[PDB]
Ligand binder design. Structure first.
Ligand SMILES: *C\C=C(C)/C=C/C=C(C)/C=C/C1=C(C)CCCC1(C)C
Ligand SMILES: CCCCCCCCCCCCCCCCCCCC
Ligand SMILES: CCCCCCCCCCCCCCCCCCCC
Ligand SMILES: CCCCCCCCCCCCCCCCCCCC
Ligand SMILES: CCCCCCCCCCCCCCCCCCCC
Ligand SMILES: CCCCCCCCCCCCCCCCCCCC
Ligand SMILES: CCCCCCCCCCCCCCCCCCCC
Ligand SMILES: CCCCCCCCCCCCCCCCCCCC
Ligand SMILES: CCCCCCCCCCCCCCCCCCCC
Ligand SMILES: CCCCCCCCCCCCCCCCCCCC
Ligand SMILES: CCCCCCCCCCCCCCCCCCCC
Length: 265
């Protein structure tokens, strides 16, 4: 299956790496529940015309709470302690760790997080339907090809890499279109909102880049190095959780602040 199930079957997990990974992944879904309440409760502070952005954030929160909770359980319930070795090992009598929950979550969120900025910023010379359709197409393909390449994570490394680069192509298309969007979005609005739009752009850039970083993390120290272990698994799930909080929660808080700033007129 995956690099996680490999380590779980071929070397096992120190209680620290196991309990750490369960804790960070719990942090993950708990934060999505906190954000859900935040977006619902704040929806009154923004004019009707921006509220659709809050709505989309609330929906993203629901789909990340539900799927990142499924994955938390999947990770905990997939390994059992061995008293002889004192380490956690993949259980043959379980579901086995399965990261489809995460890709299913990305496939849902991606249209919604890309669509929502289009409800707070106005374009200048670009058409709303062109940006939208371009976001949705390459957002879906980025994920689908990323899911395919992930089927070869442990087995064929070279396929894992060439698919990753395919999925990166679509990612770079999205970063291109988002940059145009942020440029046209800057025209006209106050300097304060231009400041927030620039913050949104940097956070969008880093936070989305963390995801390919966590996809390559075990092989980053070579095909036999330090991260090729329970420590790369630890780091991979830590980066993911950081990327989840930033691109899903923090992103929508920033768009909310912008919308309020745009109601000063
Ligand atoms: C949770 C919400 C979103 C928008 C998640 C986004 C995830 C990514 C941008 C993942 C990207 C990948 C890339 C760029 C290439 C390797 C495979 C990944 C799917 C991890
Ligand atoms: C708007 C007011 C912002 C307060 C939000 C504080 C969130 C606290 C997180 C849980 C502690
Ligand atoms: C700009 C207004 C103030 C920002 C408040 C952001 C609060 C977001 C709520 C989600 C964060 C919860 C963190 C603790 C949960 C565990
Ligand atoms: C309007 C008050 C701000 C609500 C904060 C969201 C609740 C966070 C729960 C933790
Ligand atoms: C539209 C937002 C709700 C999406 C939920 C996705 C389905 C959750 C599945 C959890 C267990 C599998
Ligand atoms: C097109 C593929 C996008 C992601 C689909 C992954 C679905 C996995 C569902 C979880 C399986 C739980 C068992
Ligand atoms: C307005 C949101 C349109 C996309 C939501 C669902 C994303 C893909 C689901 C499969
Ligand atoms: C300048 C306003 C703050 C922008 C970034 C805030 C998020 C940093 C991580 C918390
Ligand atoms: C576009 C893919 C970005 C991957 C970031 C990983 C950088 C590894 C540095 C070593
Ligand atoms: C806005 C979030 C910034 C996160 C920076 C990257 C976090 C580094 C964690 C690396 C662990 C190895
Ligand atoms: C004007 C810009 C102000 C943006 C505030 C950004 C900070 C949002 C705080 C939410 C972070 C929740 C993370 C909690 C994880 C522990």
């Amino acid at each position: 299956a995956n690099f996680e199930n490999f380590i779980g079957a071929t070397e096992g997990f120190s209680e620290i790496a196991y309990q750490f990974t369960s804790h960070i992944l719990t942090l993950g879904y708990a934060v999505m529940l906190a954000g859900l309440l935040y977006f619902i409760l704040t929806i009154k502070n923004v004019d009707k015309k921006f509220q659709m952005s809050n709505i989309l954030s609330a929906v993203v929160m629901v789909s990340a709470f539900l799927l990142l909770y499924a994955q938390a359980q999947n990770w905990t319930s997939s390994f059992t302690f061995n008293e002889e070795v004192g380490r956690y090992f993949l259980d043959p009598s379980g579901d086995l760790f399965n990261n489809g929950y995460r890709y299913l979550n990305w496939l849902i969120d991606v249209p919604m997080l890309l669509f929502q900025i289009l409800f707070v910023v106005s374009l200048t010379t670009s058409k709303f339907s062109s940006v939208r359709n371009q976001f949705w197409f390459s957002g879906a393909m980025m994920i689908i090809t990323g899911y395919i390449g992930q089927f070869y994570e442990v087995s064929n490394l070279t396929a894992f890499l060439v698919w990753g680069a395919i999925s990166s192509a679509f990612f770079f298309h999205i970063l291109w279109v988002m940059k145009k969007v942020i440029n046209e979005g800057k025209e006209g609005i106050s300097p304060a909102g231009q400041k927030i739009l620039s913050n949104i752009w940097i956070l969008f850039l880093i936070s989305w880049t963390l995801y390919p970083g966590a996809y390559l993390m075990p092989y980053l120290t070579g095909v036999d190095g330090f991260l090729y272990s329970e420590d790369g698994v630890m780091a991979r799930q830590l980066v993911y959780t950081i990327a989840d909080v930033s691109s899903k929660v923090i992103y929508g808080v920033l768009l909310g602040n912008l919308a309020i700033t745009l109601s000063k007129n």
